[PDB]
C-alpha cells in the first residue's frame, strides 16, 4: 500500500520548451500541471524548482502568488564560525530534507487563490500554469557549444539533461520524486537543422510559420515520474536499428560509422532481457543518444538512454568492445527495473539496484561465460569487503540516524558520497545473488516477472493512481511476492545482509587426525573489527581428497571452534588411478609433493561465495599448488595465485609457469600468474638459475622460431594470447637485480618489442598493446642515485633512462601526428613521464601536465594530466598547484572533470589529518568550507565530493590547524 506524502495527486504534466538559445545558453518555457487535491483546504501547493526564474504562475487561469526559497544554496550561514564537518552534515541533511518532495515539502510554494477554495474543498481539478526561464544554467541542462564558427548545427552544439536521481528540478518545475507518476506531454521548439530527443513517442513534428524552427511533440502515456524525464537537443545523425525498428540511435555528426558498428549488438541484449523475464520491453520506442562532455558514462531514463561518445569504437578496436557492450547492457537493465518499476521511498532503492545489477550479471554470464561471471562476482565482493572494512559499512534498507559510523547522512541520495553510492549498488546486486542462492533462479525470475506484470497491468489504466502505484515496488511487497512464489521467506537472510550493515571475516586452519581419519577444521571469526559482524548460519566447505571432491555443511554457532568432518580412503595412491575432480572429469596428478598420511589435496571454505566474506585459510604450499593446477573453478585458481606469493619455493614457480603455458586455462588467471611469477622471482634472487622469468616463455609463445629476439608480426585475432602478450612484459618489467635495479636483459627485451612491432597485417588496432609497452617501460624505472641533491642535468642522466626517455618522446610526438584510440599512448606517456619525475630522473616540473590539463586535451588526457598534477602537489607540497586545482574545481566547463579532480584529490590527498604540513592554514580551511557551503551548490556531486575532501583532510572534528 502506497499513501502519498503530498496532499495532492498529479495526473498529467505538459512541458513546453521554446527559444533554446545556444549563444546565450538560455531556454524559455512553461509547465502546466494537472493536480487533484486529496485533502480539502489544500491552500499552499509545494513544487520543486532549482535555477529556474519563475515569471508567472496561474492556477485555473487565475493569478496566484508564489514564494521561492532554496535552503540548499548556502547550507550554513556565512557568519557562523563553525568549522567541524558533523555540523555541516547535519545542516546539509536538514536542508535537503527541507526541499524533499518525499516529505510534503518543496522549494516553490504557490498559494491557491481565495475564489478557488470552494473548488478545492470538494475535491476538483486544479491546472497550474507556471512559465519559467533558465538564464544561464549551472549544471541543470548541459550546453556543449564548440567555438568553431558557422551555424549551431554546423559547429556541433547540443544540449542534454545531466544529473543523478531527482535532478529534473534543475531544468523545469515539477514534483521531483520517484513516487509521483503522471502522464506526460513534451513539446520542444528547436532549430530546423536540429533534432530534439526525449521520452515517450514522437507523435508529430510541425514547422514554424517561417520554417526556420520546428516543434517536436512527444507523448508519454506510460505514467513515469518527473525524475525519469530527459532531453537531448542537437544536430544528431539518426540511425534506425536494422534489426529492431522501434529503436533509433542518435550520434554526433561525423560519427555515424562508429555508431553503426557500436550499436549493432543491442538487439541481442533486448532479446536476452525479454526472454529471461517474460515481459516485452514496456515502452513503445527506445532511443540511444551519444553526446559529448557527459555527466556519467551511461544514464538511463524512461524510454531513453544517454551515453557518452567515448564509448563509440570502430570494428578494429578491441579492449573497448566488452566495456561498451556491458554499458549498453546495464542501461537496458535499468530501463526494465529502474524506470518502469520505480521506487516507493528512498528506502527500497536496494531492491531496484539489486534487480538491475543481478539481471545484468545474468546477461554477463550468458554473453561472456560463467568464468567471466565468477571473476566479476569475486571482484565485486573484494571491492565491497575492502570498502566495508575501510569505513564502517553499507546499509541497504535503513529505517528512519541508522548509520552513524560515517560522515554523511544516508536519508537522501544527494547527501551520499559517490563511493558509497557505487558500493551501495554493488552490495545490492550481491545480496540479490544471495537471495537467488537461497531461492532458486527460476523462482527469482518468476518474482521479477510477477513485478513486471503487475506494473504492466497498472501501466494501461487511466485511474489517477488508484492503480498506478502498483508500478512502485517496496521491500515488503518484494518479500511478499517472493513468499508468494516460493513459500519460503528470506527474513533471516534479509535481517543479516540487508538490515545489519557488515561483512564477515573467516580465519581457518585445519589438522588431519590420522588415527580416526578425520579432518579437524578450526574456523574463527574476527567480529570486533569496525566493519565486521558475526555469522551464525551454515557454511559450505569443499574438500578435495584422493577419492574426489566432497562438500560438507558446517554449523558455525557463536561458541563453535573445532569442526570434525570425515575423510575418505587413500587407495588412489596405492594404484595409480586418476583422481576425480569437482566436475565429472578426472586427471593425473603428481602426488610426490603430497603428504603420505593425509588423503586430502585441498580445502576451500565457502567456495560458492554464499556469504559476504573474506577468507584467510592456512593450507600447505603444495595444497595451494594443487589447487592452482587442477581446480575447475576460476576463483579458487585466483585465490591460490594470491596465496602463492607467500611461498616462493621453486615448486610454486613451476606451478605458475605451468599455468602460464596452459591454454584452456581462463585468461584472467594467466594474467594474474604473470604478476605472481614476477613477485616470486623478485623474492628468490640469488637462487634463480637461468634467464629472467617469462622471457623464454615469451619467446616460445609470441616470437619467431628462427629468431628469438624478433617478435612475430602482430596478429591479434585470438583475443586471449593478445591479452596475455600485452600483459606479460608489464609484469616482466617488475623484475629486479640483487642491486634493486631492473636487469638490462628485460629492458633490452622490452625495447626490442617496441622496435620490431609491425601492425600492417592484422585487422585490429595496436593502441592498447603499444600503450601497455609504455606501461612496461614505466615499470622498469628504479629510483636514481642523486648525489648531494645534484640538479637533474644531462651529465647525471641514467644510461638506461635515456633510452626510455627517447622512446616515450618518440611515442608522444608520433601521437601528436598520428593519434591512436582514446589517446591511449598520450595517457601512457604522461603516466610514464610522471613515473620518471617521481624518481630523480626528470626535473619535477608540472608545466607539461598543466598544459595537457588545459580544457582541450582528451578527457582522458585531461584526467591523466590532472592525476599527475595531484601527485605532484602531494609530493612537492605545492601551494600554487593546490590553488590551481581548487580553481579548476570551481570553474571548469566539464562537470565530470570537476568531480574527477575532487575524487583524485580525495584518493591521493595533499595531506591527511595526522600530517603537519605547510598547507594547513586557516585560509585553506576557509576555502574548503566555502566550497562545501557555497560554490558547489549546483551539482549535488561536487558538494558530496567536497564533503569527502574536507573529511579526508581535516576529519570529523574541528580543523586542528586553526585558532
Amino acid at each position: 500500500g502506497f499513501e502519498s506524502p503530498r496532499p495532492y495527486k498529479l495526473t498529467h504534466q505538459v512541458v513546453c520548451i521554446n527559444n533554446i538559445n545556444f549563444q546565450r545558453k538560455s531556454v524559455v518555457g512553461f509547465v502546466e500541471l494537472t493536480i487533484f487535491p486529496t485533502v480539502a483546504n489544500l491552500n499552499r501547493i509545494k513544487l520543486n524548482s532549482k535555477q529556474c526564474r519563475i515569471y508567472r504562475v496561474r492556477i485555473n487561469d487565475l493569478e496566484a502568488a508564489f514564494i521561492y526559497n532554496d535552503p540548499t544554496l548556502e547550507v550554513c550561514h556565512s557568519e557562523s564560525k563553525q568549522r567541524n564537518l558533523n555540523y555541516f552534515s547535519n545542516a546539509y541533511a536538514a536542508a535537503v530534507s527541507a526541499v524533499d518532495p518525499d516529505a510534503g515539502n518543496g522549494e516553490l510554494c504557490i498559494k491557491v487563490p481565495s475564489e478557488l477554495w470552494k473548488h478545492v474543498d470538494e475535491l476538483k481539478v486544479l491546472k497550474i500554469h507556471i512559465n519559467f526561464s533558465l538564464d544561464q544554467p549551472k549544471g541543470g541542462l548541459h550546453f556543449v557549444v564548440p567555438s568553431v564558427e558557422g551555424s549551431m548545427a554546423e559547429r556541433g552544439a547540443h544540449v542534454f539533461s545531466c544529473g543523478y536521481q531527482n535532478s529534473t528540478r534543475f531544468w523545469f518545475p515539477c514534483v521531483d520524486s520517484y513516487s509521483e507518476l503522471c502522464t506526460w506531454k513534451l513539446e520542444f521548439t528547436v532549430d530546423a537543422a536540429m533534432v530534439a530527443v526525449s521520452n515517450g513517442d514522437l507523435v508529430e513534428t510541425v514547422y514554424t510559420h517561417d520554417m526556420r524552427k520546428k516543434t517536436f511533440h512527444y507523448m508519454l502515456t506510460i505514467p513515469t515520474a518527473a525524475s525519469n524525464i530527459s532531453l537531448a537537443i542537437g544536430p544528431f545523425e539518426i540511425l534506425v536499428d536494422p534489426y529492431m525498428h522501434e529503436v533509433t540511435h542518435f550520434c554526433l555528426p561525423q560519427l555515424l560509422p562508429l555508431l553503426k558498428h557500436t550499436t549493432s549488438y543491442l538487439h541481442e541484449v533486448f532479446e536476452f532481457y525479454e526472454e529471461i523475464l517474460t515481459c516485452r520491453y514496456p515502452y513503445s520506442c527506445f532511443k540511444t543518444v551519444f553526446i559529448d562532455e557527459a555527466y556519467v558514462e551511461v544514464a538511463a531514463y524512461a524510454s531513453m538512454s544517454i551515453f557518452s561518445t567515448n564509448l563509440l569504437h570502430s570494428a578494429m578496436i578491441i579492449d573497448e568492445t566488452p566495456l561498451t557492450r556491458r554499458c549498453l547492457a546495464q542501461s537496458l537493465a535499468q530501463q526494465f527495473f529502474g524506470c518502469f518499476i520505480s521506487r516507493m521511498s528512498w528506502s527500497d532503492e536496494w531492491v531496484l539496484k539489486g534487480i538491475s545489477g543481478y539481471i545484468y550479471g545474468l546477461w554477463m554470464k550468458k554473453t561472456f561465460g560463467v568464468n567471466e561471471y565468477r571473476h566479476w562476482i569475486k571482484e565485486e565482493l573484494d571491492k565491497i569487503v575492502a570498502y566495508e572494512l575501510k569505513t564502517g559499512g553499507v546499509l541497504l534498507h535503513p529505517i528512519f540516524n541508522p548509520a552513524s559510523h560515517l560522515h554523511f547522512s544516508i536519508k537522501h541520495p544527494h547527501t551520499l558520497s559517490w563511493e558509497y553510492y557505487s558500493m551501495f549498488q554493488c552490495k545490492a546486486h550481491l545480496v540479490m545473488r544471495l537471495i537467488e542462492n537461497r531461492i532458486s533462479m527460476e523462482f527469482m525470475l518468476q518474482v521479477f516477472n510477477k513485478l513486471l506484470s503487475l506494473a504492466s497491468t497498472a501501466s494501461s489504466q487511466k485511474f489517477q493512481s488508484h492503480m498506478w502505484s502498483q508500478m512502485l515496488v517496496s521491500t515488503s511487497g518484494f518479500l511478499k511476492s517472493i513468499s508468494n512464489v516460493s513459500g519460503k521467506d528470506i527474513q533471516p537472510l534479509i535481517k543479516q545482509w540487508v538490515d545489519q550493515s557488515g561483512v564477515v571475516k573467516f580465519y581457518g586452519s585445519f589438522a588431519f587426525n590420522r588415527k580416526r581419519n578425520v579432518l579437524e577444521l578450526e574456523i574463527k571469526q574476527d567480529y570486533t573489527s569496525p566493519g565486521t559482524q558475526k555469522y551464525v548460519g551454515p557454511l559450505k566447505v569443499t574438500v578435495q581428497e584422493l577419492d574426489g571432491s566432497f562438500n560438507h555443511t558446517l554449523q558455525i554457532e557463536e561458541n563453535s571452534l573445532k569442526h570434525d568432518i570425515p575423510c575418505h580412503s587413500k587407495s588412489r595412491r596405492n594404484k595409480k588411478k586418476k583422481i576425480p575432480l569437482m566436475n565429472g572429469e578426472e586427471v593425473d596428478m603428481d602426488l610426490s609433493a603430497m603428504d603420505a598420511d593425509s588423503p586430502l589435496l585441498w580445502i576451500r571454505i565457502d567456495p560458492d561465495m554464499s556469504v559476504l566474506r573474506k577468507v584467510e585459510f592456512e593450507q600447505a604450499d603444495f595444497m595451494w599448488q594443487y589447487q592452482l593446477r587442477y581446480e575447475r573453478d576460476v576463483v579458487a585458481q585466483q585465490e591460490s595465485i594470491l596465496a602463492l606469493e607467500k611461498f616462493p619455493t621453486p615448486a610454486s614457480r613451476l606451478a605458475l609457469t605451468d599455468i602460464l603455458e596452459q591454454e584452456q586455462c581462463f585468461y584472467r588467471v594467466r594474467m594474474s600468474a604473470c604478476f605472481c611469477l614476477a613477485k616470486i622471482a623478485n623474492s628468490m634472487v640469488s637462487t634463480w638459475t637461468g634467464p629472467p622469468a617469462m622471457k623464454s616463455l615469451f619467446t616460445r609463445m609470441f616470437c619467431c622460431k628462427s629468431c628469438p629476439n624478433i617478435v612475430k608480426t602482430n596478429n591479434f585475432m585470438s583475443f586471449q594470447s593478445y591479452f596475455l602478450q600485452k600483459t606479460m612484459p608489464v609484469a616482466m618489467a617488475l623484475l629486479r637485480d640483487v642491486h634493486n635495479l631492473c636487469p638490462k636483459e628485460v629492458l633490452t627485451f622490452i625495447l626490442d618489442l617496441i622496435k620490431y612491432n609491425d601492425n600492417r597485417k592484422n585487422k585490429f588496432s595496436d593502441n592498447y598493446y603499444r600503450a601497455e609497452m609504455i606501461d612496461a617501460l614505466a615499470n622498469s624505472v628504479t629510483p636514481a642515485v642523486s648525489v648531494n641533491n645534484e640538479v637533474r642535468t644531462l651529465d647525471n642522466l641514467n644510461p638506461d633512462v635515456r633510452l626510455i626517455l627517447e622512446e616515450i618522446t618518440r611515442f608522444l610526438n608520433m601521437e601528436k601526428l598520428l593519434p591512436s584510440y582514446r589517446h591511449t599512448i598520450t595517457v601512457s606517456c604522461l603516466r610514464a613521464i610522471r613515473v620518471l619525475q617521481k624518481n630523480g630522473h626528470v626535473p619535477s616540473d608540472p608545466a607539461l601536465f598543466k598544459s595537457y590539463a588545459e580544457y582541450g586535451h582528451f578527457v582522458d588526457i585531461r584526467i591523466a594530466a590532472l592525476e599527475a598534477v595531484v601527485d605532484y602537489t602531494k609530493v612537492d607540497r605545492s601551494y600554487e598547484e593546490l590553488q590551481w586545482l581548487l580553481n579548476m574545481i570551481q570553474n571548469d566547463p566539464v562537470p565530470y572533470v570537476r568531480h574527477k579532480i575532487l575524487n583524485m584529490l580525495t584518493k591521493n590527498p595533499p595531506f591527511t589529518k595526522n600530517m603537519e604540513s605547510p598547507l594547513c592554514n586557516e585560509a585553506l580551511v576557509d576555502q574548503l568550507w566555502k566550497l562545501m557551503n557555497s560554490g558547489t551548490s549546483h551539482d549535488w556531486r561536487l558538494r558530496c565530493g567536497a564533503v569527502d575532501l574536507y573529511f579526508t583532510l581535516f576529519g570529523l572534528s574541528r580543523p586542528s590547524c586553526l585558532p
Partner: peptide, 25 residues
C-alpha cells in the same frame, strides 16, 4: 633543444575526435 626535443603539447577543441577515431581503416 638539440638533444631530446619534445613537440609542445597543443590542446584541441574536441579531444575525443583526435583520440578514439582510428586513423588507418
Amino acid at each position: 633543444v638539440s638533444t631530446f626535443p619534445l613537440i609542445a603539447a597543443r590542446p584541441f577543441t574536441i579531444p575525443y575526435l583526435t583520440a578514439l577515431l582510428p586513423s588507418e581503416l
